[PDB]
Amino acid sequence: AAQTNAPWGLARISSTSPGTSTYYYDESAGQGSCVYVIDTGIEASHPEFEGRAQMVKTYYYSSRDGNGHGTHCAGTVGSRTYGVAKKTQLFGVKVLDDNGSGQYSTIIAGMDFVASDKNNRNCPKGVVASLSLGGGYSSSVNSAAARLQSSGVMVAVAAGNNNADARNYSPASEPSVCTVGASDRYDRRSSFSNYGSVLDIFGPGTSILSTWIGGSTRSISGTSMATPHVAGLAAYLMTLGKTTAASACRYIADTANKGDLSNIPFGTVNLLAYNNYQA
Template sequence: MKYSLVISTSVLLSTFTTTLAAPVNPPATAVAAAAADDTDEYIVVLAPTEKRPWAQVFTDLGYNMTSRTHAISVNKHTFGTNYGDLRTFGKEVRAFTTHMKGSDAASLSSLPGVLSIEKDVKWTVKVQRFNETYGTHNLKDNKWSFPAVKRQQDQMNQVVQQSTAPWNLGRISTAQPLVSNGREVIDLKFNYQFERSSGIGIDVYMLDSGINTQHVDFGGRAKMVFTAFGNDITDGHGHGTHTAGTVGSTTFGVAKNVNLLGVKVLDAQNQGSLSSFVAGVDFAVSSHMQRRSQPGFKGSIINMSLGGPGFSQPLFQALQRATQAGMHVAVAGGNDNTDSCQFSPAQFSQLLPIINVGASNVVDQRWEHSNYGKCIDIHAPGDGIVSTSNKGPQAMEPMSGTSMACPAVAGAMAVELLKNPNLDPAGLKQLILSKALNGVLQGVSGGNLLLNNGLRAIG
């Protein structure tokens, strides 16, 4: 049974108002109309100055805590601490989710200690299987083997060429359009030039459907660190394994030495709740803060190949905290062939130093389903992208979407961050955009940038 407020709104107002400090930012006004008074799940974000224990906060809110089980164990597989049907977030965000009526949500939103209240909506992340007749293939037929990185300083910037790369890697390391020369878009016959160091020591948090960590192409560098689904750390969809492969797998990855950290916020249907996304970002920030003092740490990146319609205040606040903590963020522009500014987190690129990515195809056109507009910072290859699959330890398959373009940018960010460790998120964003090819894409209005690593190979 879902928990609800046990005292009247008037009592709650008088109690809560006197115990919470004023918020840094004004509370969000977009809550359910009290007239409808439907019961729904909400995310309640408190002011950053609120530091009291959760039990005290909930007591002042008017929740009956005596009949509830207080601390269910918190570990890497949990969402937070549960108080009955209340569910809190982690260390970096003072927030919780609960079932309540629209009138209660409207009342809570006016309290000086509440930063924002928003319905906990569920988003489905769209992705296209490139060709269902292609199926999945195994890596055993691919002869490429990336030589192990040697950490001697004189080899860190050595350039390596891979001749068995997917087309997206070939395109981002050449200034010229790709010429087919008999190659199909899903062939692993393209040339990719990259630096041997290639993101070593960089942590990339993959907010997605999970990672098939047993895939041989990850070379033991991928692990699951968080899930919003109980103890389920599997990738039931394949979206997360695919995006992780484009960031940093041996064959398909832009940055072939990064640490791939799976943050599971999408289920087997590629669906996830807004609260899970916020909790995933919150976990990544907490982990980043801990990792900064550990040996070998070089920086943190968040890849978010996900999103949904409208402006989400809790998700904006979470990503704002991430960038303020020095984390670098790449987000997918969306696959609805419409204005990317209508979606979160894509539209945050106008307010935060994050990179919003649109998708292009193999002939340098905007991919037909890619979102567009002023909120798109850069494009990257996203149509018919071959990468790692969840279907086995050697499986690979092609997918299409801005979800496939976004991790290419995250990988490029990892490469540049290793060479420029002192860059803040705004500085790294500017560097990535400055190295891009300008004006080469067809069907793009406004900013016309295509991701490039500056090595200028022959694709």
């Protein structure tokens, strides 16, 4: 399949070169996979989800995404214009309030919920979790993500927007999850993107157009935007049987475009998420 006029990030993970506009992907498009979007929630009613999104848990008075951030990242995962895996299942886990913030104890609880709730879902191709969040280093937030990962969920986390080494940030610094950095449309490291040795992969993260609350769209930026690209990629590749929940990060790093990225500080991997689609 081929999406013409795709967002630059979708066309980026389907090409070895920047500047294209067509997103080439396999027609399976992540069908049979589930991606938990651990964020401010999802506006499941957004027509770009076509009823493949639903809120499964909230930690606040409402399950509504009164912020937009969770609706945006779920959009990059599997919305049908702005999503990587345009046929996947989207489960909203609202651990962030409508200010895009939330306590560590709430984030940990949301990760432990996803670890258990997935045993109630129908995800024959595997379970992915997209974590567009992250404060400072926490051994507890780190080990919650590791728990979620070892429970059989491919965990993708944002490196953080602090232009620093990600080892001082959670769940970014947890070794066993997929720590995603951000890049821009000219294959530069995003100006805000965290780096370091804990990073596993870079995704399109600057000026990412995707769904927004109120049936709208919005272009924003952050490693929080690069994470859904990788989560959707993992979900898409798991549907194809190319990898597993436990291997998907290594596979995406093995099959990534190596060396294409500028301003990659010495010691940080130079890998751009790439789906290696051939027709």
